[PDB]
Design an enzyme around this catalytic site. Structure first.
Site, mmCIF file in Angstrom:
data_model
loop_
_atom_site.group_PDB
_atom_site.id
_atom_site.type_symbol
_atom_site.label_atom_id
_atom_site.label_comp_id
_atom_site.label_asym_id
_atom_site.label_seq_id
_atom_site.Cartn_x
_atom_site.Cartn_y
_atom_site.Cartn_z
ATOM 1 N N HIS C 75 0.820 -1.206 0.000
ATOM 2 C CA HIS C 75 0.000 0.000 0.000
ATOM 3 C C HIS C 75 0.858 1.262 0.000
ATOM 4 O O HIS C 75 0.515 2.250 -0.660
ATOM 5 C CB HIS C 75 -0.960 -0.009 1.192
HETATM 6 C C1 LIG Z 1 5.029 -4.817 6.166
HETATM 7 C C2 LIG Z 1 3.736 -4.086 6.394
HETATM 8 C C3 LIG Z 1 3.696 -3.048 7.317
HETATM 9 C C4 LIG Z 1 2.502 -2.373 7.538
HETATM 10 N N1 LIG Z 1 2.463 -1.342 8.451
HETATM 11 C C5 LIG Z 1 1.285 -0.670 8.682
HETATM 12 C C6 LIG Z 1 1.233 0.357 9.611
HETATM 13 O O1 LIG Z 1 2.253 0.664 10.226
HETATM 14 N N2 LIG Z 1 0.040 1.027 9.830
HETATM 15 C C7 LIG Z 1 -1.097 0.668 9.130
HETATM 16 O O2 LIG Z 1 -2.162 1.244 9.310
HETATM 17 N N3 LIG Z 1 -1.044 -0.353 8.216
HETATM 18 C C8 LIG Z 1 0.139 -1.018 7.988
HETATM 19 N N4 LIG Z 1 0.175 -2.032 7.066
HETATM 20 C C9 LIG Z 1 -1.085 -2.383 6.346
HETATM 21 C C10 LIG Z 1 -1.903 -3.290 7.260
HETATM 22 O O3 LIG Z 1 -1.195 -4.476 7.559
HETATM 23 C C11 LIG Z 1 -3.219 -3.615 6.579
HETATM 24 O O4 LIG Z 1 -4.027 -2.457 6.628
HETATM 25 C C12 LIG Z 1 -3.900 -4.795 7.263
HETATM 26 O O5 LIG Z 1 -5.091 -5.135 6.598
HETATM 27 C C13 LIG Z 1 -4.232 -4.470 8.711
HETATM 28 O O6 LIG Z 1 -4.678 -5.653 9.325
HETATM 29 P P1 LIG Z 1 -5.140 -5.629 10.860
HETATM 30 O O7 LIG Z 1 -5.649 -4.260 11.224
HETATM 31 O O8 LIG Z 1 -6.286 -6.582 11.064
HETATM 32 O O9 LIG Z 1 -3.904 -5.970 11.639
HETATM 33 C C14 LIG Z 1 1.349 -2.730 6.841
HETATM 34 C C15 LIG Z 1 1.388 -3.771 5.915
HETATM 35 C C16 LIG Z 1 2.585 -4.444 5.692
HETATM 36 C C17 LIG Z 1 2.631 -5.558 4.689
#
Ligand SMILES: Cc1cc2nc3c(=O)[nH]c(=O)nc-3n(C[C@H](O)[C@H](O)[C@H](O)COP(=O)(O)O)c2cc1C
Ligand SMILES: Cc1cc2nc3c(=O)[nH]c(=O)nc-3n(C[C@H](O)[C@H](O)[C@H](O)COP(=O)(O)O)c2cc1C
Ligand SMILES: Cc1cc2nc3c(=O)[nH]c(=O)nc-3n(C[C@H](O)[C@H](O)[C@H](O)COP(=O)(O)O)c2cc1C
Ligand SMILES: Cc1cc2nc3c(=O)[nH]c(=O)nc-3n(C[C@H](O)[C@H](O)[C@H](O)COP(=O)(O)O)c2cc1C
Ligand SMILES: Cc1cc2nc3c(=O)[nH]c(=O)nc-3n(C[C@H](O)[C@H](O)[C@H](O)COP(=O)(O)O)c2cc1C
Ligand SMILES: Cc1cc2nc3c(=O)[nH]c(=O)nc-3n(C[C@H](O)[C@H](O)[C@H](O)COP(=O)(O)O)c2cc1C
Ligand SMILES: Cc1cc2nc3c(=O)[nH]c(=O)nc-3n(C[C@H](O)[C@H](O)[C@H](O)COP(=O)(O)O)c2cc1C
Ligand SMILES: Cc1cc2nc3c(=O)[nH]c(=O)nc-3n(C[C@H](O)[C@H](O)[C@H](O)COP(=O)(O)O)c2cc1C
Ligand SMILES: Cc1cc2nc3c(=O)[nH]c(=O)nc-3n(C[C@H](O)[C@H](O)[C@H](O)COP(=O)(O)O)c2cc1C
Ligand SMILES: NC(=[NH2+])NCCC[C@H](N)C(=O)O
Lengths: 175, 175, 175, 175, 175, 175, 175, 175, 175
Positions: C75
């Site tokens: 993203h």
């Molecule tokens: C390596 C990596 C790092 C990420 N870091 C963030 C972050 O710091 N903040 C954020 O909002 N999304 C981040 N994302 C995107 C989220 O992982 C993504 O929105 C995911 O669907 C969130 O899942 P969850 O809220 O259920 O943990 C990251 C994705 C990846 C692959």
């Protein structure tokens, strides 16, 4: 001038696929070809394993459509890239598909897409080579302009004398 | 009377399979065909995905023998049902199989079992279309009574002028 | 100058996803956009199949986080690359997620990471479009600065008049 | 006249999903509804198992898009078919998705497609029911025209008094 | 008296998830917390791996409903157990789900069931933090009583000053 | 001038593998190393998960021979590419394999192929560190020219003072 | 002397493959053949199931290359072993491949390797048998020296009068 | 008498495993050995594919313990059968395992069980061959009575002059 | 006091693992040991099956790292728990790994973490026992303080006289 000739090398499911390392050394160390890409039939991959071919040629062989990245498609990209196309070893199966315009895998579709000097080196035992259907396919491929290198009898077929036919194609392509 | 003509529509693994929804709208909204069943080759299915074709045509495409229910067999059931058979897009591969009576999947077996006017719309690039083996297959299919709609060159081939050929077959079937 | 605008294109699980190749040809052959990268939701991928989209657009669509290679994350890398972001077709589902800052897949996370003119072209039937919840989401996205291209009702919704909205975004970005 | 009312019944992943057979007997044997089709969320299916619901209701519950056959799509077909829509039991999760127009599974997309009297019977414990976010969704759904049957506290929430709300909707639909 | 405070610690899929061991050492070796249980989102688990978290924290993190054994359910058991709830790091996605009462995995369902001081430490880059939807979610959570620790800009976001907020919550819980 | 030094970084299955992001931040954000490629043992990958390491180092970690692309083989290509080789954390298992010329995975084969300054930072508890076999391997590695950073006792071992040892190796490589 | 004739028996994916046990009983109990080995196409195996054929013929049917043990290869070994080769039932598909020297599975490769009297008993419905491509293949096989037993049409084809042709082949082989 | 000498041949995961067919032809067609059985490491199998090795040597190579049938075990049966044991090519890895009595697969366990003259032909590049640990293993094997054929430098190591060492061992065994 | 001695019992992949039930009955019913935990190598588990060891000893054996729950790790937890460590039967492979401080599975890592009297009872045939590498490993382990029970020759090795060595270790531990 052979160093810029792009050699496309197809490998079919024959006993003689074990000769691929020796032939690769001859192509690079004696003829001087630099750009070589390989296409393996599914049967060739299952007999020889595609991973060692990759390590010794410097390119992953193309076997599945998924191996082509980006726009287009494996057969168009490989077919347009090739300055010379060599099928070595070719199966009797390959002869039939090439002779009749069948294109049901990457190799035989690439044959339809390639427009370059092509050498086919079939290998099979004597019983198979003598079948009327096989010989019709050999004849048909020659009339279509393909150079056929007939196998030898190494007792169990073996590769014929392909070196001259391949060198001829590389020189024609260089010109 | 075109609303009761049963159209069997084969789809092969060509770039031009993306045109299937568009062709379907033309068949339904302009020609007035109502009963349309599709057969996809494994390669067409792998490229396009069958679920959207199902959603816009009203029938799941048949690819595996398992998709036919009950007695008989997919090729016999679909072959007898068809009033018109259209292969669009057809691959070079398809031309080779149809010209020589190969029946190694549902689509090409259905070709042997169907007894109705048939239109074949091959798509391929200019290098492939010019191969002697391909043209032998085109000629052989025309001699066997198949209507071939030759491709265009949409810069990478594209579908020819199939609308007239398909309409003619649908009307001939209505009589 | 439209040839240097980097267009990021999100694709959701709508009937109108079959129009993606047609829209891609319009973007390339008429507007002149050269660099186009696609993001498909899991549902879009399950309906349309990413391999044909890859073959006609020149890039594998991104769906899973694993599809981004190297440092960072899909993203952030896609969001920073984009000069224009187009969601076409957008689902009712997408409108809800974008309007409320939900980011539970690559596409909706990229929306949060992108800082560029964005056009959203939702497609759905008339009953869905008329829902109060859907219209709250449409209104909220406009207040947030998103350009919404309302659907048509082509009998089962269809894409609205997006060409002017997309052209505007590409031109504004070119400046 | 209630026997021709088509009742669409959504089931979410709540403890109270164990009441589905009892509610089914009441709907058929006391209220007299004849056509009842169920939609289960993935979580509901994982807790209750979909095969028994099928055996006792006479229809396979719809959970995946693949369960809809032919043209269109699960949410349009079920949404147009429904004369009354009942979500019982509903999760807090469902309230949030319905309140904001989220449509990320068959059930919540069918909600967007349905145009009929709709009863929602949420179940959750007291801590969850008292959260400000949950109550905002309850209020928003009432403002959108949905009938909310508030849970009781059966010690761990339990279904509220839904019989009157469902009967009212069935009668409204019959008229 | 901080040794009897039960700290529930939710971990989302952020770059800052790598800080979980360091924060754990600070909580145990400096603040003196003894009972710490973790809940990971599916994305957090896919990034960090739950087996190493388990080895350094003394408890297997809960991600799937199946990880709860016996009667009840993961969100009710963990929510009732918690004396303090910390989400660190929290994603933008989490802010949206928590702000709107979405409960579509264990973590966000546990949020609805917990009744204790709660600290949320979101991390995201500057573009995402600046989105209107994200700031609406932050404001909404503050109005609902959640403590938001705003991120830093560590060049790619980084955790804000959570040490003060968490210690305050732990001491408030001890009283 | 350290920014062009190619750092190859092996990660073994130790508790201290959670320190990899912190060490990486020091290497990239403070020392200025730009090209860092990691090799994870099967155990390191199973405990830590390769996805986050990839996101912060800019390269997918290599564990299986297939994770490396093209000719030459993984150990030869990575071994020749490396200007500095760092094993951090190293297991007792690694010391044993490195001391005896065992090469039964990518990492230990890469050790045999690498010809560059090498720092090994083992971590293990006090019982393991005191074993005679372990201390023989440490001594043998020192005689073979490897720089060993002995662990500390951080309550269960912890990494020693590696920054000076790594800085020295990076400077030797740039020279 | 018929008890020592080695009969190689190919079975294709035809409705008439159910007749294999009855034909086997005649070969053993009336003609007196003792050594019978079968080769089944993938489609035959999918229809009839190879385990019962093994139980009544005394040998596991060969379908995949992996079934041949030791040096050489299934088609050479079976082809050299055969004193008589019978294809019963043969499909239209088989006729096409055998007529054109296609060898893309074990059965059709064995045809090329066999050097013995061969009887082919095709089965198919009336529409397929009347196709020009099919009749060209029948003629070509007759010119190549193969004995074709034409089907009957027992209402859906049925096996022709093979007893005379097979007995003749078995007897000549004994001589 | 060399035709009755039983040759056991181990193959390791080296580039030079592609020479196995060539070496086999020399052993059979020039030296006259008749009974040759091969054991492949998992890595050798993954590179070369055991199926072609089986077809050209007349015996399926043993890789898994499951390949031994009946009483005892693969390493005991093969070790007792061997009159001469040849490891060609041997990896640096093999040298380490054999030098230290490690027996963690069929090949290295068979080495401990064999009581016959043994020739080891390692292959590796110049960086690996020069490592102190590797040379310690070479020296240790020589002290234990193993015949080491040092590699050559074929620009990527290559097999040394093994023909003399193998011939000597076969002749001594025949005597 | 022998009833409170904690016996850790490792099982390797030897023929003599069939003796485990007999040894377990001797340990419990004759010596009086009450707390016995077992560790099986992957090879021991694959030969003997892990389920019955559990049924006859009262504890599931530990084989994979995943079998340890909570903080730390299987080898640290098991190594600290053990008052006596017995490897019975031990393989030649085990002797090599223990002698050189290799720790590439749970068992050999637990050896590095254990600090208690240890008895090792290797079993192998006479050819293997006589190898210089094996006797080097035996010698090295005795110098490191391990009690080695040499095998007998049960015609195929068999367990030596371990009762006295184990009893001595258990009694010394009670002191
Ligand atoms: C390596 C990596 C790092 C990420 N870091 C963030 C972050 O710091 N903040 C954020 O909002 N999304 C981040 N994302 C995107 C989220 O992982 C993504 O929105 C995911 O669907 C969130 O899942 P969850 O809220 O259920 O943990 C990251 C994705 C990846 C692959
Ligand atoms: C070990 C082995 C060796 C084979 N060698 C040959 C051969 O030399 N020539 C041939 O025509 N077929 C040979 N075959 C049969 C082909 O592999 C078979 O016809 C296959 O379908 C050909 O596939 P392909 O043409 O797509 O590669 C061999 C088969 C096996 C199992
Ligand atoms: C993306 C893509 C597009 C292709 N387009 C064509 C095409 O237009 N015409 C053609 O003859 N082959 C085309 N091919 C090659 C065929 O898919 C290939 O010949 C395949 O074996 C045909 O399978 P089928 O005839 O059973 O569908 C294409 C392949 C790919 C991967
Ligand atoms: C064949 C099919 C067509 C669909 N078309 C639409 C559509 O046009 N608009 C819409 O909002 N949902 C449509 N849906 C429902 C969405 O796919 C569903 O809401 C899904 O959860 C959206 O996923 P996404 O937004 O992540 O792509 C369709 C579903 C199917 C199966
Ligand atoms: C055994 C069990 C019972 C549950 N009961 C409820 C409940 O009664 N109400 C609720 O809001 N969530 C309940 N949950 C949590 C929901 O299943 C969770 O929020 C889920 O994501 C909702 O999924 P759905 O709305 O798509 O069905 C329960 C979970 C489990 C494991
Ligand atoms: C959670 C956990 C932490 C571990 N930490 C260490 C450690 O710090 N040092 C060590 O020598 N082994 C440690 N081990 C044991 C190693 O993982 C084990 O010896 C493994 O076989 C080493 O594999 P590798 O050297 O190929 O990475 C740990 C194991 C687990 C499960
Ligand atoms: C139930 C069933 C019966 C079939 N019977 C025949 C048949 O009698 N003759 C024929 O030519 N094809 C028949 N077919 C079609 C073939 O199975 C199809 O052409 C197939 O690809 C042939 O495979 P094979 O020649 O490799 O055995 C039948 C198919 C099915 C599903
Ligand atoms: C394509 C390729 C070629 C290799 N060639 C060699 C080699 O020639 N010598 C060597 O010591 N290792 C070589 N390796 C590394 C070994 O395969 C690696 O050490 C492996 O663990 C050895 O396994 P084995 O001894 O059990 O066969 C090669 C690896 C690959 C992927
Ligand atoms: C049935 C069978 C019995 C075996 N018995 C022994 C044995 O008694 N001693 C030995 O050193 N190896 C024996 N082996 C070989 C070992 O299993 C082999 O060295 C294995 O890699 C050892 O694994 P482990 O030490 O991790 O248990 C036997 C193998 C099999 C298949
Ligand atoms: N100690 C070393 N090996 N240093 C590396 C030698 C090559 C040198 N850094 C150039 O530039």
């Amino acid at each position: 001038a052979l160093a810029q000739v792009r050699l496309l090398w197809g490998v079919c499911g024959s006993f003689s696929a074990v000769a691929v390392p020796h032939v690769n050394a001859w192509l690079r160390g004696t003829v001087g070809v630099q750009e070589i890409r390989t296409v393996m039939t599914a049967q060739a991959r299952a007999l020889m394993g595609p991973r060692m071919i990759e390590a010794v040629t410097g390119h992953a062989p193309v076997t599945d459509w998924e191996d082509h990245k980006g726009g287009g498609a494996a057969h168009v990209a490989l077919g347009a890239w090739a300055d010379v196309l060599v099928i070595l070893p070719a199966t009797a199966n390959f002869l039939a598909k090439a002779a009749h315009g069948i294109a049901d895998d990457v190799l035989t579709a690439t044959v339809l897409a390639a427009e370059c000097p092509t050498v086919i080196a079939p290998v099979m035992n004597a019983a198979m080579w003598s079948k009327p259907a096989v010989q019709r396919n050999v004849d048909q491929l020659r009339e279509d302009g393909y150079r056929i290198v007939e196998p030898k009898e190494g007792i169990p077929g073996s590769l014929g004398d392909f070196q001259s036919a391949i060198s001829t194609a590389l020189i024609q392509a260089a010109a």
